[PDB]
Homo-oligomer: A and B are copies of this chain.
Amino acid sequence: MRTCLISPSSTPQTCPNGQDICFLKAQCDKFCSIRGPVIEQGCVATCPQFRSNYRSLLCCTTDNCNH
């Protein structure tokens, strides 16, 4: 069913079977002071658990909602 925006181009793509949630994740690694968070967009079966190094995490259930 679901189509989501995918990294790195933020282009809409069909989700793999069993993954009906779109996500947008901004996470800081050891290099956040050099280049800021890495942005990841994709499909998931379950909204990921929030981590202490996430600037933000959006999970949503409308097509291409993860922007």
Contact = CB atoms under 8 A, between A and B. Distances in A.
B46 A47 contact: no
Contacts of A62: 55-56
Contacts of A46: 50
Nearest to A24: B58
Total copies of this chain within the assembly: 2
Contact of A55 (B47, B54, B60): B60
The 5 closest A-B pairs by CB, nearest first: A47-B50, A56-B60, A58-B58, A50-B59, A57-B59
A57 B55 CA distance: 14
A26 B58 CA distance: 11
A16 to B, nearest CB: 18
